[PDB]
Amino acid sequence: RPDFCLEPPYTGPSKARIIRYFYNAKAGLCQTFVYGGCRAKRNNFKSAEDCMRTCGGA
Amino acid sequence: IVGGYTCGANTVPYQVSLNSGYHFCGGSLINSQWVVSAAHCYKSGIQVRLGEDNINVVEGNEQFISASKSIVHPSYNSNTLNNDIMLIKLKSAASLXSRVASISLPTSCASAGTQCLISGWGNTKSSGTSYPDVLKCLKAPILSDSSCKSAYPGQITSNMFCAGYLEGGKDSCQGDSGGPVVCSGKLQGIVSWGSGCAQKNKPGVYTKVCNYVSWIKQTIASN
Ligand SMILES: [Ca+2]
Ligand SMILES: [Ca+2]
Ligand code: NA
Secondary structure (H helix, E strand, O other): OOOHHHOOOOOOOEOOOEEEEEEEOOOOEEEEEEEOOOOOOOOOEOOHHHHHHHHOOO | OEOOEEOOOOOOOOEEEEEOOOEEEEEEEEEOOEEEEOHHHOOOOOEEEEOOOOOOOOOOOOEEEEEEEEEEOOOOOOOOOOOOOEEEEEOOOOOOOOOOOOOEOOOOOOOOOOEEEEEEOOOOOOOOOOOOOOOEEEEEEEOOHHHHHHHOOOOOOOOEEEEOOOOOOOEOOOOOOOOEEEEOOEEEEEEEEOOOOOEOOEOEEEEEHHHOHHHHHHHHHOO
16 A cells, blocks of 8 residues: 655645644655644654654655 | 735734744734634644734743633534634733734624735745744735635635635735734634635635624633
8 A cells, every 4th residue: 555654745725834744755754844734644743753653664 | 924015013913923832823812811713723732922023033022821721613623624713711811002902803794805904924935935033914805705615616614705816926824824814903814724825716715703703702701
C-alpha cells in the first residue's frame, strides 16, 4: 500500500497558521510546515517525536 | 491578509491574537471576558493577546491573558466546517479603555455588497509565504449566497458566507482564521476557509455570525 509518510505536506483549506511536522523523505528528516487546521492528512504530526516514531526510516 | 494595507497601531481594538507559543489564529473581543473565534482554532494552552500591533515585539499596550474556557459550537463539524465558531473566556477580565475594546454583535445579517473590514496577522502572499509583524487590514464586500455556492459547489452551508473579489488578489489567508469581518460596526463574520488565498473565482468563506447571536449571548451567560 502507498506509504502516507511519502505524501507531500497538506495545509488544507482552513486559515489557521498551526505549525506541524511532516516526514520529508527527500531530506530524510521530520520538517515543519503550516497546517490550516482542518482535513489533515496523515503525514502531519504535533511533534518531531511523533513524526519520527511514525515515519522514521520511510 | 493578501492585498490589504497596514491598519495602523491599535486601529482595530477588538482584534486579538491567539497564541500557543506563537500566533496561530485571530479572534474578536466581544466583552471584557469573552472572545469569538473559529472552532478550528481550538488548541491547547491558548493565550489571548490583546492590544497588539507588532506581534513580535513588546510595544507597551499589550495584555496577555490565558483562556480559562474554550467552547466550540455543539454542532461544529470538522469535516464540512459547518458551525465554525468558538467562544473563549479570558481567565481574568481584560482592561478596556481606546486600544482594547469590544465589537458589537449584529442585530441582523448583512446584505450582499456591504463593504466590511477584514483583519489579521496571516500570510500576505497568494503564492508563497510572508507573515507580517503588524496588523493588516482589507476592505471587502459580502458576496451573494448564489455566487458563493457557484464558487464552492456543495460546500456552502446556511452558516457560511463569501466575501472578497472574484478577480483575485485580495483575501484572508493562513493565520487569519478566527479573526473578524466587521461591517458597519458589527461583527458579521469569522475568518474560516477557502480554496487557497486570493485566487480568481475563489473568495474567502466566513462563519455567519448573525446566525449565532442568541447562542453566543446565552453561552457566555451560562459560563
Ligand atoms: Ca523543517
Ligand atoms: Ca506586541
Ligand atoms: Na507598531
